[PDB]
Amino acid sequence: SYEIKPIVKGTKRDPSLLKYNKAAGAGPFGTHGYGGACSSLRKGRPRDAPDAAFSEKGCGKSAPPKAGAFKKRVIPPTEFRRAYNRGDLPIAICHGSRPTVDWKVEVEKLDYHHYLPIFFDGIRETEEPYMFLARQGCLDLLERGGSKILPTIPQLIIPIKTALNTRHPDIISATLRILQHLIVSDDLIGEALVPYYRQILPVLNLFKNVHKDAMDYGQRNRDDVGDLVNETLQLLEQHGGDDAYINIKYMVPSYESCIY
Amino acid sequence: REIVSCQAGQCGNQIGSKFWEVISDEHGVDPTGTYQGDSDLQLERINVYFDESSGGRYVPRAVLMDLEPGTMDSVRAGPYGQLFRPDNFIFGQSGAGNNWAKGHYTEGAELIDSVLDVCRKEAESCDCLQGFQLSHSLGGGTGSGMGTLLISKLREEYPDRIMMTFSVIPSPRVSDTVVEPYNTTLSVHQLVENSDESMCIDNEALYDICFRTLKLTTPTFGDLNHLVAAVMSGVTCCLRFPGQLNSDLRKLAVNLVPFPRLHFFMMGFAPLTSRGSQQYRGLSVAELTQQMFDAKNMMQAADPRHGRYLTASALFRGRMSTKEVDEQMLNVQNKNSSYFIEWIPNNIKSSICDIPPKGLKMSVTFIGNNTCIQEMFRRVGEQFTGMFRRKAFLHWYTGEGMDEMEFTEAESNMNDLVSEYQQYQDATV
Amino acid sequence: MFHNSYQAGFLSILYSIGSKPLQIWDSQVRNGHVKRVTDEDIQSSVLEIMGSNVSTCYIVCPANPKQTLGIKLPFLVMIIKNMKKYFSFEVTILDDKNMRRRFRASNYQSTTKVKPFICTMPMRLDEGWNQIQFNLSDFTRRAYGTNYVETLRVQVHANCRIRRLYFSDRLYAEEELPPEFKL
Amino acid sequence: LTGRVLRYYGYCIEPVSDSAVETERVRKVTLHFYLEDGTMSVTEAKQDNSGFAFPANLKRHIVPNPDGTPITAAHLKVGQSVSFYGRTYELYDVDPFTRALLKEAGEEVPPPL
Amino acid sequence: MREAICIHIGQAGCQVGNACWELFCLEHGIQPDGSMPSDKCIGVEDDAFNTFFSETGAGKHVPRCLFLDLEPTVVDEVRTGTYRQLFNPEQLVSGKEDAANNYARGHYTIGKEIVDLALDRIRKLADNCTGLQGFMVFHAVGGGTGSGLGALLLERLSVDYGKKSKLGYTVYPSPQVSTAVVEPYNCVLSTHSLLEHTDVATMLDNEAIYDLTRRSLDIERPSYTNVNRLIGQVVSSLTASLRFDGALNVDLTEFQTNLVPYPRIHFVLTSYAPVVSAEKAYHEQLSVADITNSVFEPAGMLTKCDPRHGKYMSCCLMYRGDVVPKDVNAAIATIKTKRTIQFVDWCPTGFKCGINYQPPTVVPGGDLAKVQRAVCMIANSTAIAEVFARIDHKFDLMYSKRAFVHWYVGEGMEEGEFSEAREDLAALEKDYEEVGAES
Amino acid sequence: MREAICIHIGQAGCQVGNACWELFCLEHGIQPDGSMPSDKCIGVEDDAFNTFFSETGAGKHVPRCLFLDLEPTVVDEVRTGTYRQLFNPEQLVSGKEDAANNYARGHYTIGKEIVDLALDRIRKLADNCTGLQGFMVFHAVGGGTGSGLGALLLERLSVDYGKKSKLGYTVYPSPQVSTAVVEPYNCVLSTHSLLEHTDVATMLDNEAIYDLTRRSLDIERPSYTNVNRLIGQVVSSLTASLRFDGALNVDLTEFQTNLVPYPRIHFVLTSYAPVVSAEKAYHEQLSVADITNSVFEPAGMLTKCDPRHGKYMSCCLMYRGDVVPKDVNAAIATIKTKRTIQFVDWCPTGFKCGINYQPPTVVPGGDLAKVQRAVCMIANSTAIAEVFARIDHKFDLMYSKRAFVHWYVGEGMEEGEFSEAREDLAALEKDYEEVGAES
Amino acid sequence: AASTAYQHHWYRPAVSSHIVLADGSHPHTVYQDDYQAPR
Numbered sequence A: 001s002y003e004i005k006p007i008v009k010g011t012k013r014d015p016s017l018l019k020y021n022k023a024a025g026a027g028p029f030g031t032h033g034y035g036g037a038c039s040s041l042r043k044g045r046p047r048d049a050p051d052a053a054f055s056e057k058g059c060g061k062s063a064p065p066k067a068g069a070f071k072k073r074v075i076p077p078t079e080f081r082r083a084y085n086r087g088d089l090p091i092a093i094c095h096g097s098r099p100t101v102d103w104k105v106e107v108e109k110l111d112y113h114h115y116l117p118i119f120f121d122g123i124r125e126t127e128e129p130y131m132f133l134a135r136q137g138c139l140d141l142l143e144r145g146g147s148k149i150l151p152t153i154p155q156l157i158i159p160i161k162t163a164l165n166t167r168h169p170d171i172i173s174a175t176l177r178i179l180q181h182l183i184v185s186d187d188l189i190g191e192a193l194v195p196y197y198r199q200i201l202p203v204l205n206l207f208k209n210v211h212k213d214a215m216d217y218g219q220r221n222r223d224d225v226g227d228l229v230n231e232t233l234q235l236l237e238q239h240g241g242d243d244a245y246i247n248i249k250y251m252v253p254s255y256e257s258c259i260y
Numbered sequence B: 001r002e003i004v005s006c007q008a009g010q011c012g013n014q015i016g017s018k019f020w021e022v023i024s025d026e027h028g029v030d031p032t033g034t035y036q037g038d039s040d041l042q043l044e045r046i047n048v049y050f051d052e053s054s055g056g057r058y059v060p061r062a063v064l065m066d067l068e069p070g071t072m073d074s075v076r077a078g079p080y081g082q083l084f085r086p087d088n089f090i091f092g093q094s095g096a097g098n099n100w101a102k103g104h105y106t107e108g109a110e111l112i113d114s115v116l117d118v119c120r121k122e123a124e125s126c127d128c129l130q131g132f133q134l135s136h137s138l139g140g141g142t143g144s145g146m147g148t149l150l151i152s153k154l155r156e157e158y159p160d161r162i163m164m165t166f167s168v169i170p171s172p173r174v175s176d177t178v179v180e181p182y183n184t185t186l187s188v189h190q191l192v193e194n195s196d197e198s199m200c201i202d203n204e205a206l207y208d209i210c211f212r213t214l215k216l217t218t219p220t221f222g223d224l225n226h227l228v229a230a231v232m233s234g235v236t237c238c239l240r241f242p243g244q245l246n247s248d249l250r251k252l253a254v255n256l257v258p259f260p261r262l263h264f265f266m267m268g269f270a271p272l273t274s275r276g277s278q279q280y281r282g283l284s285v286a287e288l289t290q291q292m293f294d295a296k297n298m299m300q301a302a303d304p305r306h307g308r309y310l311t312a313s314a315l316f317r318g319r320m321s322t323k324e325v326d327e328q329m330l331n332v333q334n335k336n337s338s339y340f341i342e343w344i345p346n347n348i349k350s351s352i353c354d355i356p357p358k359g360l361k362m363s364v365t366f367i368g369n370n371t372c373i374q375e376m377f378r379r380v381g382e383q384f385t386g387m388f389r390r391k392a393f394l395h396w397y398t399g400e401g402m403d404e405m406e407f408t409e410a411e412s413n414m415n416d417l418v419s420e421y422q423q424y425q426d427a428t429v
Numbered sequence C: 001m002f003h004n005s006y007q008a009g010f011l012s013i014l015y016s017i018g019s020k021p022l023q024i025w026d027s028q029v030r031n032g033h034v035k036r037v038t039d040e041d042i043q044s045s046v047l048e049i050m051g052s053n054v055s056t057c058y059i060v061c062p063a064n065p066k067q068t069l070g071i072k073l074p075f076l077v078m079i080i081k082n083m084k085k086y087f088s089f090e091v092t093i094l095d096d097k098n099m100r101r102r103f104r105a106s107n108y109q110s111t112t113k114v115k116p117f118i119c120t121m122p123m124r125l126d127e128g129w130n131q132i133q134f135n136l137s138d139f140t141r142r143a144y145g146t147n148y149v150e151t152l153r154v155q156v157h158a159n160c161r162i163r164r165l166y167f168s169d170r171l172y173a174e175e176e177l178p179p180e181f182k183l
Numbered sequence D: 001l002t003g004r005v006l007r008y009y010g011y012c013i014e015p016v017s018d019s020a021v022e023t024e025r026v027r028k029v030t031l032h033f034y035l036e037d038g039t040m041s042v043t044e045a046k047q048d049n050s051g052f053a054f055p056a057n058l059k060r061h062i063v064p065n066p067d068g069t070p071i072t073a074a075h076l077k078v079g080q081s082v083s084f085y086g087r088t089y090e091l092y093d094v095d096p097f098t099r100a101l102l103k104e105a106g107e108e109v110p111p112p113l
Numbered sequence E, F: 001m002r003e004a005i006c007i008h009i010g011q012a013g014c015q016v017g018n019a020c021w022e023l024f025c026l027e028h029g030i031q032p033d034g035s036m037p038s039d040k041c042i043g044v045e046d047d048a049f050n051t052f053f054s055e056t057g058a059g060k061h062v063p064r065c066l067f068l069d070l071e072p073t074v075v076d077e078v079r080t081g082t083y084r085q086l087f088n089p090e091q092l093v094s095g096k097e098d099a100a101n102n103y104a105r106g107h108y109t110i111g112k113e114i115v116d117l118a119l120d121r122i123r124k125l126a127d128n129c130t131g132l133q134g135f136m137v138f139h140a141v142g143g144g145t146g147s148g149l150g151a152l153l154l155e156r157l158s159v160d161y162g163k164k165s166k167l168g169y170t171v172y173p174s175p176q177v178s179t180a181v182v183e184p185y186n187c188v189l190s191t192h193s194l195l196e197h198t199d200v201a202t203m204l205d206n207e208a209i210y211d212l213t214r215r216s217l218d219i220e221r222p223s224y225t226n227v228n229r230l231i232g233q234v235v236s237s238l239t240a241s242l243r244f245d246g247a248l249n250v251d252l253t254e255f256q257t258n259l260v261p262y263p264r265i266h267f268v269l270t271s272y273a274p275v276v277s278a279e280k281a282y283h284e285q286l287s288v289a290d291i292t293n294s295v296f297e298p299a300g301m302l303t304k305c306d307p308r309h310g311k312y313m314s315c316c317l318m319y320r321g322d323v324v325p326k327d328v329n330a331a332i333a334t335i336k337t338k339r340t341i342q343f344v345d346w347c348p349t350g351f352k353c354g355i356n357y358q359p360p361t362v363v364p365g366g367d368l369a370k371v372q373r374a375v376c377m378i379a380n381s382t383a384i385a386e387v388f389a390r391i392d393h394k395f396d397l398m399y400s401k402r403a404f405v406h407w408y409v410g411e412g413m414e415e416g417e418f419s420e421a422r423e424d425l426a427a428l429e430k431d432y433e434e435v436g437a438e439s
Numbered sequence G: 001a002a003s004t005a006y007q008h009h010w011y012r013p014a015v016s017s018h019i020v021l022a023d024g025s026h027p028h029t030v031y032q033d034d035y036q037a038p039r
């Protein structure tokens, strides 16, 4: 007798989400030999060991371990989950044709300095409803927030950084779309984002040229991480400043200027 | 192409004192400052490190830097500490307190003005200032903090001139300071932006060299810094003496640094052998190359087997033929191409200077921009995060004027540099 | 314990009317006593804690030290009777940077002071029954420059008379208070 | 033998290049020879107006002769020249402790110069 | 340069400082008359005494110390002792009537009586110091004057000298041996100053030094003299890094930063080894690993504090002699590999090292033997929670019946000061528990 | 390197250790103060004494010995003896009161309160040695300490040091001369522990030494001093292979695998010759063949056991001096040609030889004569069954009606321990005769 | 009649000659060695 282990990759029972988001997974609440045959038609036994590297014979087939820059990292705990479970966010799901975010309290008057960082911290989420609520709240606040988005930028850089460092392609695409909507929200916000290129760009440079005559029939989703990186880089250069190009080049050597 | 040097902190002062001893040996300069070399070549290019006085005294172009005056007294209490000009000894009344914030903002600012003044005087005296050299430790108070403030100000004043640092990064196995990760994290982000090239020196690897390789029983910091002095002289041997394949510091920087952030290098010296095995060893280019690329010969704690070489540099010294020194690189590349990056063909830069370090048939210094430096950057990164989760030993830094978010910014710089090194380690064609 | 429970409006942690009011409280008693008595002022039974040493004997919620509270409500209202004797209370809260910060108020304290884990205050209590209101969020901002997340533990020391301890989200008025929260 | 230190007063004759006030400088130093270790240290008295920021000293260690051999107590002799690290001192006097020790050891110390 | 001012409070502080100063005089070749002889025995650097002795143009070296006891016996008897010409006629302040083992008496009635003149003396102690590192205060918190007057002096020094270093090498009441009955009262009341107005406090309780002398020295009848000699050896080991040259020289502030994780957490254990007699000195191979292991052993503890009851938070080692840096590193490596002792989770480094080239000196006629190398440990650990809990448990036992409280009440102290002290303690033990709790 | 740790347990152990260390000091030119005055021909920096003496930074050498005894007169006499400065103040452990010739007393009551200290001393000995070959244990099972405390120490050393070599030069009771009456009880009880925790045990009784010294050494009245000197000569001859160069260098653990055929078979005859006085030393041409014949003679044996009443399962000769390997082969061949001495049928080889070039010494205070060559046999033979049958018959006679059993059982030993150890010795003698049996 | 840390300090006595030539002279450059006056 025996037991079978099904291949659950890309299925409803895929454990990748569970193993990459520890806080997730909760419910709605909470022998002889030759001794005279010395012949020249035999070659020495190859080493093929990690210690063989830089030896006189050579490393051989041994290779250094991968650094794992593309390794899909674990999601760090997000304050969005705890705040939502506590009830701080006046956010609900308005079920219907396409789900949307319903705001319980007046939304034009809520403290952006207190709420928007939580929403940007929530982009790292991986299960409903946390990820959807965070991303859609980000979209709404950035689309129609006003001039109060600009002062919050320095405390918004860290959540964007942490979402980018997760190396999850879906999270990268989501935070890229949210970043584009952030950039097209005001006038000076791009110039304010320029000095913080040092903390937002490395993941974009890493994922610049990653792609998922054959027509890409799935394109309304816009999950192409490399295309999103290129588009957001061009949009940053457009709605940046005079030093935006040089600041972008300082971190993405393969970038090509658009305004010039 | 004059080079002006600075020694920050106790570690920096000791390393610089031994380095100036070695350089005076190579140029035939006694502690009295008079030249007694037997050849023209030593005096031909002595102006790169030494400035001649009215009486012929060759004063080193060095500035000493430490808040503690006791070690400033001790460093010139040595025989070769009489070389330095008395006015270059700049010190404060109160020590650094082994605090990066105290050495960078409170006591650093109140003292950095005189250091910039003397450094500017030296730069003006230079006919053509090639660059600035710094020797310090990332774990100390004033060696790290005040050193980074100094490098920032010299970067601001002289942007195009070459910037060099020799940083003794502390590590837990030789952890003789509980705030070593704090200081290293607060200094690494300054070093990334303000340093053209930053050589890394490590105490575990130095002791590994002194025990496993040199076999001598009990060498102290003197013999420990002898190796760093030999390396720091072999970096600019090509500047100080002519050779078949000349090189300078921007030579190395251009042929060694692929991207602006990636300028942290591992060091190695050859030959290195015990006294009893000196006469049993046959010196040759093959032996030199094997000691260069041998993992245990590296003087920083990061195994090259765990990473890939962005670039390597071979500063050979001694009368040697050229196709064999190039053929050693041929062999290394060909039979370790798995450990070398494909999209950078011929990762090894080579240069030859005929004049060898005194007392050796033939020698070589190795510069290594391997991607495994990310491992030792991380091994300080998790330590910093461990102390920063509880934010212990942080009231000392915050009461000296530092801001809370600066530590997170330093974490950001560490993680970004590590991510860049990982990306370019696993990047394909 | 209240992380998964409803936390809005009012949340009583101690009430002198329940059958066994100290379900979630550890009566750490040394040279003292905790008992339910009948107060002549209000003609009702209230908690009554005595002790020669204020520090040794006290009551702490939750009883299990590893376990902790999860109340988000920034206001803490305590109906306690001034016994003309030394009194103190302790509130451990969790700040946004994830430290346990510890706000204490005592009547024997001279002046307020802030130390990297604790913030000690003096209190002045009028004769008779008192309604002490403790605004955790505002005082955390004032004494630490740090946001208030939620309170972890409440520990009111001995040598006092206690009616009801309850957390509220906002500064409710006396008229707006429910009849069972009155005095 | 932990605290046994021989004293040797000496002076250094040092020409001065372009000083309006003087052409020669005499640097009076004291050599301490630790009989425990054989180490030697050089100290210089700090004068009130010597013009030096801090005096030139030499921390105790095994001071070698220019050839390479370490300097023992035999090399240090009163009225004689001791050379090390390119620096030459003419010994002229000792303290009573060193004087008596040399007397009983048998070496006749020259009278102070 | 690098001046440090010694303060001695109480009779216990007086004897501790007397031993410290004889040891300093032996180390710096200063005869009891106050001047070095014509034939030096030390051969140490010329600036070694500058941190502890002011050099007068006549050639005499005056200690930079202030003795301050509220009763004249000890001070006058030192004035008549061997160091008459060594010690300054001033800087030797004597009170007329004793504090009588009462913290309130030594802090309110007589502490304010003598504190003005104490600060007047300290002003001229400090004006001659151009690089004053800090004040090293020796006292015993279990006495009356040593607690109350020490507290008031620390308050005034902190309020007038800014953020100068305060190294309080104080003697705590021992777990079982205690010479006074109001001693826990004095300790708990002095904790007010020892938590706020001092920088780094070192415990020197008598029982651990007693056991060290009984076991290591193999001497059956050790006394306050031996205890004070050991304390002076520890102080000299701590200050040798700034007194003399070394591989890793550290001043007061250098380990002040490394040894204090939080402002409250500054009470640090101490332990010195190898401490051996002349009989066993020459028959043992004193190695760096052996001496470090003996230091980490409870035998080497100078405090009655078992390390296994807590977690080490930050250790600092002061090696003296021919100690080699990688020898130190090998000792540290074997200590980390050792499992019976554990460090707190959030402090992975946790180790400070400083090597000095001056071997420890030996007092003639003493019990210490000539050692080629030695090492002194100063360590902040969470194991102090048990001793603090025992001392305030004794305080609670006496204060439950309000015994001996009228004595403190009548000397100008409000009766609620006892409750305030108990609150400060109860905060301290379980804030130590907080910092030792796993993340 | 190649250190051997000496462990002298009991009175007999202390005496033989004193003799052995006198002999070793005379070997290595170590003065009673513990230093070499001046040696020019003997090259400097030559350390052949590392196996017995550990150096100190002052140039003084300390023996690697532990003198463990439960009663103080012998250890105190050794303390006051000639080797005051040589022997370590510690490593010289002396108890309060003797084991009273009681194995239970030495193994359960006073042995327990001293074995921990003895093991601490042993650890302090062993950590110094980086190449420790093994432990050389000297004791007499006849007494109380040498039986019980020796058993306890060996039992704990086995688990503490794993499979480290243990050479116990043990003094078992003699056939008819006894210095005690409960001696058979002590021997029977200790043999059980020694079987499990003794790698090789060596016969060292007293009657054979007395008879050998009376016949060959030609002195009418030998005593314990002469016996101990002969024992020390045997030990030095056995251990000199790792001390000096030779054609056949052998370590302590090397003959462990050659002399022990079965795990329960480890009790070995010892012989030494030429043990002759200077009266006949010049009379006899003491050649290699002559000394080998005298060694193989049962008369020259150092135990009162009969090789001809058994079969030599194995032998290990140690030639010391100018012995040629050719002469060794000649002696071995002429021995094999003999008939009276015979090997077992399953061990045709049965021979081991080790040649050291250093000639044996002569010790002043002893009756031995200087010879350019000597040889010591360590041989496993089935004849040990005779002595064990004799001692266990004595044990059965004593335990038949339980004489002296209350004394043993009072200390805390099980009453069934006597019986169970007796079946142990019964199985021991059984496997003796069955391994002596032919195929 | 008459090993601290001061033993371990080793400092070079003076300028040490090269071992490249037997005379100890500082070596000539490759240019000077190979390109001389023709013989």
Ligand SMILES: Nc1nc2c(ncn2[C@@H]2O[C@H](COP(=O)(O)OP(=O)(O)OP(=O)(O)O)[C@@H](O)[C@H]2O)c(=O)[nH]1
Pocket (backbone or CB within 6 Å): E009, E010, E011, E012, E013, E015, E016, E069, E070, E071, E098, E099, E100, E101, E102, E139, E140, E141, E142, E143, E144, E145, E146, E147, E171, E178, E179, E180, E183, E204, E206, E224, E225, E227, E228
């Ligand atoms: N280590 C050490 N401890 C001492 C010494 N003398 C006394 N002590 C202890 O320290 C405690 C307090 O002593 P002090 O600081 O002099 O306070 P005090 O006893 O009240 O002194 P007075 O008020 O002047 O009488 C005593 O209970 C002793 O146990 C000493 O010489 N060395």
Ligand SMILES: Nc1nc2c(ncn2[C@@H]2O[C@H](COP(=O)(O)OP(=O)(O)OP(=O)(O)O)[C@@H](O)[C@H]2O)c(=O)[nH]1
Pocket (backbone or CB within 6 Å): F009, F010, F011, F012, F013, F015, F016, F070, F071, F098, F099, F100, F101, F139, F140, F141, F142, F143, F144, F145, F146, F147, F171, F173, F178, F179, F180, F205, F206, F224, F225, F227, F228
């Ligand atoms: N060779 C030799 N044997 C001795 C000496 N002293 C005692 N013995 C042996 O010790 C045996 C008797 O045991 P004890 O007299 O009790 O001595 P012990 O075995 O050391 O035990 P305790 O003295 O009781 O501690 C005798 O059979 C002797 O063989 C000695 O000086 N030389």
Ligand SMILES: Nc1nc2c(ncn2[C@@H]2O[C@H](COP(=O)(O)OP(=O)(O)O)[C@@H](O)[C@H]2O)c(=O)[nH]1
Pocket (backbone or CB within 6 Å): B008, B009, B010, B011, B014, B015, B066, B096, B098, B137, B139, B140, B141, B142, B143, B144, B168, B170, B174, B176, B177, B203, B206, B221, B222, B224, B225, E247
């Ligand atoms: N190689 C070498 N390293 C040293 C020396 N002195 C100190 N260090 C290293 O420097 C670190 C401490 O630096 P520190 O002296 O406190 O720097 P500072 O406070 O700025 O003077 C330690 O981790 C040592 O490993 C030396 O002489 N040689």
Ligand SMILES: [Mg+2]
Pocket (backbone or CB within 6 Å): F010, F011, F071, F098
């Ligand atoms: Mg006996």
